[PDB]
PDB file of C-alpha atoms and ligand atoms in Angstrom:
ATOM      1  CA  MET Z   1      -5.385  14.340  13.495  1.00  0.00           C
ATOM      2  CA  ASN Z   2      -8.287  12.201  12.334  1.00  0.00           C
ATOM      3  CA  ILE Z   3      -9.507  10.806   8.964  1.00  0.00           C
ATOM      4  CA  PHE Z   4     -11.457  13.993   8.164  1.00  0.00           C
ATOM      5  CA  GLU Z   5      -8.489  16.295   8.676  1.00  0.00           C
ATOM      6  CA  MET Z   6      -6.244  13.925   6.707  1.00  0.00           C
ATOM      7  CA  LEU Z   7      -8.525  13.698   3.693  1.00  0.00           C
ATOM      8  CA  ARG Z   8      -9.274  17.460   3.823  1.00  0.00           C
ATOM      9  CA  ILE Z   9      -5.527  18.039   3.450  1.00  0.00           C
ATOM     10  CA  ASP Z  10      -5.198  15.515   0.638  1.00  0.00           C
ATOM     11  CA  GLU Z  11      -8.321  16.489  -1.355  1.00  0.00           C
ATOM     12  CA  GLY Z  12      -8.661  20.205  -0.639  1.00  0.00           C
ATOM     13  CA  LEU Z  13     -12.027  22.007  -0.676  1.00  0.00           C
ATOM     14  CA  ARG Z  14     -13.559  23.484  -3.797  1.00  0.00           C
ATOM     15  CA  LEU Z  15     -17.152  24.780  -3.916  1.00  0.00           C
ATOM     16  CA  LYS Z  16     -17.443  24.865  -7.715  1.00  0.00           C
ATOM     17  CA  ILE Z  17     -17.261  21.833 -10.063  1.00  0.00           C
ATOM     18  CA  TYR Z  18     -13.622  21.128 -10.975  1.00  0.00           C
ATOM     19  CA  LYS Z  19     -11.624  18.369 -12.628  1.00  0.00           C
ATOM     20  CA  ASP Z  20      -9.615  16.062 -10.367  1.00  0.00           C
ATOM     21  CA  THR Z  21      -6.123  14.764 -11.096  1.00  0.00           C
ATOM     22  CA  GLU Z  22      -7.579  12.211 -13.607  1.00  0.00           C
ATOM     23  CA  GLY Z  23      -9.643  14.836 -15.385  1.00  0.00           C
ATOM     24  CA  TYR Z  24     -12.982  13.787 -13.830  1.00  0.00           C
ATOM     25  CA  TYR Z  25     -15.629  16.266 -12.691  1.00  0.00           C
ATOM     26  CA  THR Z  26     -15.552  16.551  -8.929  1.00  0.00           C
ATOM     27  CA  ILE Z  27     -16.729  18.990  -6.251  1.00  0.00           C
ATOM     28  CA  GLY Z  28     -16.226  19.768  -2.550  1.00  0.00           C
ATOM     29  CA  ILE Z  29     -13.685  17.602  -0.738  1.00  0.00           C
ATOM     30  CA  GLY Z  30     -12.943  15.063  -3.427  1.00  0.00           C
ATOM     31  CA  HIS Z  31     -16.508  14.144  -4.241  1.00  0.00           C
ATOM     32  CA  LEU Z  32     -16.477  12.488  -7.691  1.00  0.00           C
ATOM     33  CA  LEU Z  33     -19.522  13.478  -9.738  1.00  0.00           C
ATOM     34  CA  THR Z  34     -18.966  11.503 -12.920  1.00  0.00           C
ATOM     35  CA  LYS Z  35     -16.314  10.061 -15.162  1.00  0.00           C
ATOM     36  CA  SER Z  36     -18.287  11.347 -18.150  1.00  0.00           C
ATOM     37  CA  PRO Z  37     -16.670  14.127 -20.247  1.00  0.00           C
ATOM     38  CA  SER Z  38     -19.993  15.996 -20.142  1.00  0.00           C
ATOM     39  CA  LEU Z  39     -20.228  18.963 -17.752  1.00  0.00           C
ATOM     40  CA  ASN Z  40     -24.003  18.755 -18.110  1.00  0.00           C
ATOM     41  CA  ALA Z  41     -23.947  15.156 -16.882  1.00  0.00           C
ATOM     42  CA  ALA Z  42     -21.843  16.325 -13.897  1.00  0.00           C
ATOM     43  CA  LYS Z  43     -24.249  19.119 -13.148  1.00  0.00           C
ATOM     44  CA  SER Z  44     -27.171  16.663 -13.098  1.00  0.00           C
ATOM     45  CA  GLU Z  45     -25.279  14.371 -10.731  1.00  0.00           C
ATOM     46  CA  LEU Z  46     -24.544  17.333  -8.504  1.00  0.00           C
ATOM     47  CA  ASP Z  47     -28.175  18.402  -8.367  1.00  0.00           C
ATOM     48  CA  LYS Z  48     -29.250  14.814  -7.550  1.00  0.00           C
ATOM     49  CA  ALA Z  49     -26.592  14.578  -4.789  1.00  0.00           C
ATOM     50  CA  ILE Z  50     -27.479  17.867  -3.081  1.00  0.00           C
ATOM     51  CA  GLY Z  51     -31.216  17.839  -3.728  1.00  0.00           C
ATOM     52  CA  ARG Z  52     -31.571  21.277  -5.303  1.00  0.00           C
ATOM     53  CA  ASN Z  53     -30.638  23.096  -8.518  1.00  0.00           C
ATOM     54  CA  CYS Z  54     -27.018  24.120  -7.754  1.00  0.00           C
ATOM     55  CA  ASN Z  55     -25.855  25.229 -11.198  1.00  0.00           C
ATOM     56  CA  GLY Z  56     -22.396  23.861 -10.405  1.00  0.00           C
ATOM     57  CA  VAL Z  57     -21.819  25.536  -7.035  1.00  0.00           C
ATOM     58  CA  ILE Z  58     -22.424  24.373  -3.458  1.00  0.00           C
ATOM     59  CA  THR Z  59     -21.984  25.809   0.024  1.00  0.00           C
ATOM     60  CA  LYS Z  60     -19.346  24.776   2.463  1.00  0.00           C
ATOM     61  CA  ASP Z  61     -21.949  23.049   4.638  1.00  0.00           C
ATOM     62  CA  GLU Z  62     -23.090  20.998   1.605  1.00  0.00           C
ATOM     63  CA  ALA Z  63     -19.487  20.048   0.802  1.00  0.00           C
ATOM     64  CA  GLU Z  64     -19.000  18.886   4.376  1.00  0.00           C
ATOM     65  CA  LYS Z  65     -22.200  16.818   4.264  1.00  0.00           C
ATOM     66  CA  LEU Z  66     -21.049  15.011   1.047  1.00  0.00           C
ATOM     67  CA  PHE Z  67     -17.697  14.471   2.756  1.00  0.00           C
ATOM     68  CA  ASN Z  68     -19.297  12.856   5.820  1.00  0.00           C
ATOM     69  CA  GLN Z  69     -21.346  10.597   3.523  1.00  0.00           C
ATOM     70  CA  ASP Z  70     -18.253   9.678   1.497  1.00  0.00           C
ATOM     71  CA  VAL Z  71     -16.058   8.841   4.484  1.00  0.00           C
ATOM     72  CA  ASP Z  72     -18.887   6.759   5.956  1.00  0.00           C
ATOM     73  CA  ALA Z  73     -19.204   4.921   2.619  1.00  0.00           C
ATOM     74  CA  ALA Z  74     -15.472   4.250   2.376  1.00  0.00           C
ATOM     75  CA  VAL Z  75     -15.389   2.735   5.880  1.00  0.00           C
ATOM     76  CA  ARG Z  76     -18.540   0.654   5.338  1.00  0.00           C
ATOM     77  CA  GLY Z  77     -17.091  -0.520   2.020  1.00  0.00           C
ATOM     78  CA  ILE Z  78     -13.968  -1.804   3.778  1.00  0.00           C
ATOM     79  CA  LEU Z  79     -16.072  -3.603   6.409  1.00  0.00           C
ATOM     80  CA  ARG Z  80     -18.175  -5.294   3.665  1.00  0.00           C
ATOM     81  CA  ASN Z  81     -15.182  -6.406   1.652  1.00  0.00           C
ATOM     82  CA  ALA Z  82     -13.988  -9.877   2.583  1.00  0.00           C
ATOM     83  CA  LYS Z  83     -10.422  -9.129   1.478  1.00  0.00           C
ATOM     84  CA  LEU Z  84     -10.126  -5.775   3.225  1.00  0.00           C
ATOM     85  CA  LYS Z  85     -11.978  -6.283   6.478  1.00  0.00           C
ATOM     86  CA  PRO Z  86      -9.493  -8.725   8.040  1.00  0.00           C
ATOM     87  CA  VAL Z  87      -6.535  -6.453   7.195  1.00  0.00           C
ATOM     88  CA  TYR Z  88      -8.353  -3.352   8.470  1.00  0.00           C
ATOM     89  CA  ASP Z  89      -9.290  -5.096  11.730  1.00  0.00           C
ATOM     90  CA  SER Z  90      -5.681  -6.094  12.244  1.00  0.00           C
ATOM     91  CA  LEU Z  91      -4.458  -2.484  12.056  1.00  0.00           C
ATOM     92  CA  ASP Z  92      -4.041   0.195  14.739  1.00  0.00           C
ATOM     93  CA  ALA Z  93      -6.040   3.419  14.571  1.00  0.00           C
ATOM     94  CA  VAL Z  94      -3.597   5.584  12.625  1.00  0.00           C
ATOM     95  CA  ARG Z  95      -2.985   2.921  10.032  1.00  0.00           C
ATOM     96  CA  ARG Z  96      -6.756   2.414   9.697  1.00  0.00           C
ATOM     97  CA  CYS Z  97      -6.915   6.062   8.582  1.00  0.00           C
ATOM     98  CA  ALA Z  98      -4.347   5.347   5.854  1.00  0.00           C
ATOM     99  CA  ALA Z  99      -6.547   2.449   4.650  1.00  0.00           C
ATOM    100  CA  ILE Z 100      -9.636   4.630   4.568  1.00  0.00           C
ATOM    101  CA  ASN Z 101      -7.698   7.296   2.624  1.00  0.00           C
ATOM    102  CA  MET Z 102      -6.725   4.780  -0.096  1.00  0.00           C
ATOM    103  CA  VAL Z 103     -10.306   3.453  -0.474  1.00  0.00           C
ATOM    104  CA  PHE Z 104     -11.624   7.004  -0.541  1.00  0.00           C
ATOM    105  CA  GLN Z 105      -9.280   7.866  -3.397  1.00  0.00           C
ATOM    106  CA  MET Z 106      -9.460   4.742  -5.543  1.00  0.00           C
ATOM    107  CA  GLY Z 107     -12.509   2.774  -4.531  1.00  0.00           C
ATOM    108  CA  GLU Z 108     -12.330  -0.993  -4.354  1.00  0.00           C
ATOM    109  CA  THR Z 109     -12.008  -2.100  -7.998  1.00  0.00           C
ATOM    110  CA  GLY Z 110      -8.229  -2.535  -7.863  1.00  0.00           C
ATOM    111  CA  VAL Z 111      -7.995  -4.450  -4.576  1.00  0.00           C
ATOM    112  CA  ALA Z 112      -6.698  -7.566  -6.368  1.00  0.00           C
ATOM    113  CA  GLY Z 113      -3.710  -5.530  -7.519  1.00  0.00           C
ATOM    114  CA  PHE Z 114      -2.879  -4.701  -3.916  1.00  0.00           C
ATOM    115  CA  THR Z 115      -3.002  -8.336  -2.718  1.00  0.00           C
ATOM    116  CA  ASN Z 116       0.688  -8.511  -1.873  1.00  0.00           C
ATOM    117  CA  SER Z 117       0.611  -5.171  -0.042  1.00  0.00           C
ATOM    118  CA  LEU Z 118      -2.443  -6.191   1.960  1.00  0.00           C
ATOM    119  CA  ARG Z 119      -0.679  -9.386   3.013  1.00  0.00           C
ATOM    120  CA  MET Z 120       2.402  -7.456   4.184  1.00  0.00           C
ATOM    121  CA  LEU Z 121       0.231  -4.990   6.104  1.00  0.00           C
ATOM    122  CA  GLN Z 122      -1.680  -7.870   7.765  1.00  0.00           C
ATOM    123  CA  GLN Z 123       1.690  -9.362   8.742  1.00  0.00           C
ATOM    124  CA  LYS Z 124       2.903  -6.001  10.085  1.00  0.00           C
ATOM    125  CA  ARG Z 125       5.857  -5.954   7.705  1.00  0.00           C
ATOM    126  CA  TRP Z 126       5.734  -2.178   7.443  1.00  0.00           C
ATOM    127  CA  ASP Z 127       8.881  -1.359   5.492  1.00  0.00           C
ATOM    128  CA  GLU Z 128       8.176  -4.117   2.968  1.00  0.00           C
ATOM    129  CA  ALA Z 129       4.560  -2.981   2.634  1.00  0.00           C
ATOM    130  CA  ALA Z 130       5.759   0.581   2.019  1.00  0.00           C
ATOM    131  CA  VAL Z 131       8.092  -0.554  -0.728  1.00  0.00           C
ATOM    132  CA  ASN Z 132       5.382  -2.670  -2.345  1.00  0.00           C
ATOM    133  CA  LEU Z 133       2.742   0.088  -2.158  1.00  0.00           C
ATOM    134  CA  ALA Z 134       5.004   2.458  -4.112  1.00  0.00           C
ATOM    135  CA  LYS Z 135       5.279   0.033  -7.056  1.00  0.00           C
ATOM    136  CA  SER Z 136       1.941   1.264  -8.349  1.00  0.00           C
ATOM    137  CA  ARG Z 137       0.294   3.528 -10.843  1.00  0.00           C
ATOM    138  CA  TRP Z 138      -1.204   5.173  -7.737  1.00  0.00           C
ATOM    139  CA  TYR Z 139       2.216   6.229  -6.451  1.00  0.00           C
ATOM    140  CA  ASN Z 140       3.500   7.288  -9.867  1.00  0.00           C
ATOM    141  CA  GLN Z 141       0.503   9.443 -10.713  1.00  0.00           C
ATOM    142  CA  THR Z 142      -0.019  11.108  -7.279  1.00  0.00           C
ATOM    143  CA  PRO Z 143       3.372  10.701  -5.635  1.00  0.00           C
ATOM    144  CA  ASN Z 144       3.151  13.427  -2.973  1.00  0.00           C
ATOM    145  CA  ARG Z 145      -0.155  12.108  -1.619  1.00  0.00           C
ATOM    146  CA  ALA Z 146       0.906   8.457  -1.980  1.00  0.00           C
ATOM    147  CA  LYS Z 147       4.106   9.214  -0.058  1.00  0.00           C
ATOM    148  CA  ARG Z 148       2.105  10.725   2.848  1.00  0.00           C
ATOM    149  CA  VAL Z 149      -0.267   7.743   2.959  1.00  0.00           C
ATOM    150  CA  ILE Z 150       2.628   5.265   2.718  1.00  0.00           C
ATOM    151  CA  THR Z 151       4.581   7.014   5.454  1.00  0.00           C
ATOM    152  CA  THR Z 152       1.469   6.749   7.599  1.00  0.00           C
ATOM    153  CA  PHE Z 153       1.340   2.965   6.995  1.00  0.00           C
ATOM    154  CA  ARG Z 154       5.092   2.625   7.520  1.00  0.00           C
ATOM    155  CA  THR Z 155       5.259   4.504  10.849  1.00  0.00           C
ATOM    156  CA  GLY Z 156       1.785   4.410  12.330  1.00  0.00           C
ATOM    157  CA  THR Z 157       2.208   8.140  13.101  1.00  0.00           C
ATOM    158  CA  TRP Z 158       0.836  11.362  11.583  1.00  0.00           C
ATOM    159  CA  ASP Z 159       4.330  12.666  10.849  1.00  0.00           C
ATOM    160  CA  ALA Z 160       3.762  13.084   7.106  1.00  0.00           C
ATOM    161  CA  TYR Z 161       0.738  15.317   7.788  1.00  0.00           C
ATOM    162  CA  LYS Z 162       2.013  17.402  10.687  1.00  0.00           C
ATOM    163  CA  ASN Z 163       5.088  18.178   8.646  1.00  0.00           C
ATOM    164  CA  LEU Z 164       2.913  19.977   6.098  1.00  0.00           C
ATOM    165  CA  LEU Z 165       0.516  21.382   8.672  1.00  0.00           C
TER     166      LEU Z 165
HETATM  167  C1  3H2 B 201      -7.925  -0.445  -3.660  1.00  0.00           C
HETATM  168  C2  3H2 B 201      -7.334  -1.118  -2.485  1.00  0.00           C
HETATM  169  C3  3H2 B 201      -7.253  -0.220  -1.280  1.00  0.00           C
HETATM  170  C4  3H2 B 201      -6.887  -1.028  -0.046  1.00  0.00           C
HETATM  171  C5  3H2 B 201      -6.610  -0.176   1.182  1.00  0.00           C
HETATM  172  C6  3H2 B 201      -6.714  -0.923   2.506  1.00  0.00           C
HETATM  173  C7  3H2 B 201      -5.606  -1.370   3.189  1.00  0.00           C
HETATM  174  C8  3H2 B 201      -5.738  -2.072   4.359  1.00  0.00           C
HETATM  175  C9  3H2 B 201      -6.987  -2.346   4.855  1.00  0.00           C
HETATM  176  C10 3H2 B 201      -8.096  -1.893   4.200  1.00  0.00           C
HETATM  177  C11 3H2 B 201      -7.960  -1.202   3.031  1.00  0.00           C
END
């Protein structure tokens, strides 16, 4: 497994504009278009992102291109963030994928909330980190995905993702 397979499992693939778990317009593999309630605003963002008039629908190749851009952005965001970069650099490869997954889902605005978890991950206190990570709106609102990501941090293996092919 790799970060693309992991996030494809967690986000799915949809070629028409849809609403994500928070009710925001999204397309492809978890590509957020806008937090605006306006479908027209989402359609404009989609056209700007793809570079043609899509009328709310894209091809699989286009979805995969947004996905590559979004993964690249998540990783670069971690490397630019003074609080995240040292933790990320301290981690092994599988756990780095769990970190990318979280940033892909939630962005970086709530990093301060995860200060204690980041410290436990940096210290390699995996069971304690796992317990701390679950005390979160993130876990309570998307528990099946949070559990897979947390198990990945706890074990440093892909067991939570092989399980469910
Ligand atoms: C919003 C906070 C996400 C933090 C996820 C993470 C964990 C370890 C290293 C980098 C990023």
